[PDB]
Design a binder for this molecule. Structure first.
Ligand SMILES: Nc1nc2c(nc(Br)n2[C@@H]2O[C@@H]3COP(=O)(O)O[C@H]3[C@H]2O)c(=O)[nH]1
Ligand SMILES: [Ca+2]
Ligand SMILES: [Ca+2]
Ligand code: NA
Length: 130
């Protein structure tokens, strides 16, 4: 039943609606569901990463420490259907920002092996810029 929940969810996200359903089925087979509570760091800037995240429940805050700043600066809030964690899967594997849960959060987490085959070629992901 979870495979179906995942498929139905992925087919509702515009970025992933562009993917053939057999590719979505393979993502649904391999993804892992992870759960967070408010204030929990999902990603820390400076860590080395290998996973991509799609928010299926809740919201997160994104912050980043820039070289000429002392303290991390708030960037944006993401919610259900949004995704993050792609930069460490594009080239160098370093995380470039913090991502912190802002309530009860569920993420669908995709590993590097699956991302590089099934997601990384999507233009919305490969050409993402902030
Ligand atoms: N550097 C940077 N990253 C942003 C930004 N907004 C988001 Br969401 N992010 C996401 O935060 C993630 C942290 O891990 P990552 O560097 O692997 O990918 C990042 C992006 O998906 C941004 O303005 N700058
Ligand atoms: Ca790594
Ligand atoms: Ca492409
Ligand atoms: Na990178």
């Amino acid at each position: 039943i979870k495979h179906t929940e995942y498929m139905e969810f992925l087919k509702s996200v515009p970025t992933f609606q562009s993917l053939p359903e057999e590719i979505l089925s393979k993502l649904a087979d391999v993804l892992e569901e992870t759960h967070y509570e408010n204030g929990e760091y999902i990603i820390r800037q400076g860590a080395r990463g290998d996973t991509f995240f799609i928010i299926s429940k809740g919201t997160v805050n994104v912050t980043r420490e820039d070289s000429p700043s002392e303290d991390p600066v708030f960037l944006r809030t993401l919610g259900k259907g949004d995704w993050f964690g792609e930069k460490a899967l594009q080239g160098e594997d370093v995380r470039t920002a913090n991502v912190i849960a802002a309530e009860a959060v569920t993420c669908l987490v995709i590993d590097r092996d699956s991302f590089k085959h099934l997601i990384g070629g999507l233009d919305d992901v490969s050409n993402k810029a902030y």
